[PDB]
From a paper:
Kinesins are a family of microtubule-based motors that play important roles in intracellular transport and cell division. Kinesin-1 transports cargo within cells, a process tightly coupled with ATP hydrolysis. Whereas kinesin-1 in solution is mostly loaded with ADP, ADP release is accelerated several thousand-fold upon microtubule binding. Here we characterized kinesin-1 P-loop mutations that interfere with ADP binding and determined the structure of the corresponding mutated nucleotide-free kinesins.
We were also able to crystallize in the same buffer conditions the nucleotide-free parental kinesin-1 (without the T92V mutation), following nucleotide digestion with apyrase, and to determine its structure. Remarkably this structure is isomorphous to that of ADP-kinesin10. Therefore, an ADP-kinesin-like conformation can be adopted both by nucleotide-free wild-type kinesin and by the T92V mutant. In contrast, the temperature factors of the P-loop are much closer to those of the central β-sheet both in ADP-kinesin10 and in apo-kinesin in an ADP-kinesin-like conformation (this work). Whereas we demonstrated that, in the absence of microtubules, apo-kinesin-1 may adopt two conformations, ADP-kinesin-like and tubulin-bound apo-kinesin-like, the effect of tubulin binding is to shift the balance between them and to stabilize the tubulin-bound apo-kinesin-like conformation, from which ADP is released and which is primed to bind ATP6.
Residue numbers in the entry: 7 to 122, 124 to 236, 252 to 325
The structure:
């Protein structure tokens, strides 16, 4: 921590306008939003017309550089259903202007790599979903209840999760498209299922300098969380407890409160780099969920 929080408001959608909703967010400077006369400050606040490129530049581009220096990292999208999480994390996957964080990260990683001579790179990706605290491999639909374990050096791993070596951004994008298709298997209503489950995309960048033999490894987890809007989702409550513990400098961090936070243990907090993008509707209709989303983001404020 090493945890940054950035708030992204989207425009009102046509359904909110058809209902007669009002735009209730006000902005001060670049880092504060006011709701019902209360200010909420973050590392950055994105207004409703912020482009995909600006969001990537502020939220993710530095973390990509760090992963290529051998750090681990995580980027989360958090917020109520329809607040813009998937538009932020994925966008229009193949459109140069509309693409989201994930395809831009893939582009930058490979462009950086192409720009290196004595360095040798190995890139691996995995893609899974957490639904009801159960891990399902999006690259192998026969693997639906995977367990979390620790290795001998104590690094977490998902036992038996598919790993795919990739050598081009199009290979990565093809892998994401395959996972999105496989996600439909044994699922009645995809849209509802997606809003109630977490998708986790892992990119593992390993490198060795062949003339000095130094090796570096970095893992970047990209997480599109379930809707935060009767219980709080178990992964989300675990995530809040972990962020709050890190924010107060606690020696003990309760990663074991969920499978998701156990998986991310070496890529969330400590020496790892993290950005949480909280996504919000500006609608008067969603005011109390927006308040709750902003309060979740303030968990990261260091005390
Ligand atoms: Sr869950």
């Amino acid at each position: 921590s090493n945890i940054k929080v950035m708030c992204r408001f989207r425009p009102l959608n046509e359904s909110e306008v058809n209902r007669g909703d009002k735009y209730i967010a006000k902005f001060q400077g670049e880092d504060t939003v006011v709701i019902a006369s209360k200010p909420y400050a973050f590392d950055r606040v994105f207004q409703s017309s912020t482009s995909q490129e600006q969001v990537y530049n502020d939220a993710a581009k530095k973390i990509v550089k760090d992963v290529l220096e051998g750090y681990n990292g995580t980027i989360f999208a958090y917020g109520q259903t329809s607040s813009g999480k998937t538009h932020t994390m994925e966008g229009k996957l193949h459109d140069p202007e509309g693409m989201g964080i994930i395809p831009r990260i893939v582009q930058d990683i490979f462009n950086y790599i192409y720009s290196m001579e004595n360095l040798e790179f190995h890139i691996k990706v995995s893609y899974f979903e957490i639904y009801l605290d159960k891990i399902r491999d999006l690259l192998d639909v026969s693997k639906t209840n995977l367990s979390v374990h620790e290795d001998k050096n104590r690094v977490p791993y998902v036992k038996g999760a598919t790993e795919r070596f990739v050598s081009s951004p199009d290979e990565v994008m093809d892998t994401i498209d395959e996972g999105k298709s496989n996600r439909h298997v044994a699922v009645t209503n995809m849209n509802e299922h997606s809003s109630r489950s977490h998708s986790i995309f892992l990119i593992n960048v390993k490198q060795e300098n062949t003339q000095t033999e130094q090796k570096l490894s970095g893992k970047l987890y990209l997480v599109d969380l379930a809707g935060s809007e009767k219980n709080i989702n178990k992964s989300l409550s675990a995530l809040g407890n972990v962020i709050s513990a890190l924010a107060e400098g606690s020696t003990y961090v309760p990663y074991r409160d969920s499978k998701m936070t156990r998986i991310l243990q070496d890529s969330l907090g400590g020496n790892a780099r993290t950005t949480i993008v909280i996504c919000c509707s500006p609608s008067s209709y969603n005011e109390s969920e927006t308040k709750s989303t902003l309060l979740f983001g303030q968990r990261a404020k260091t005390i």
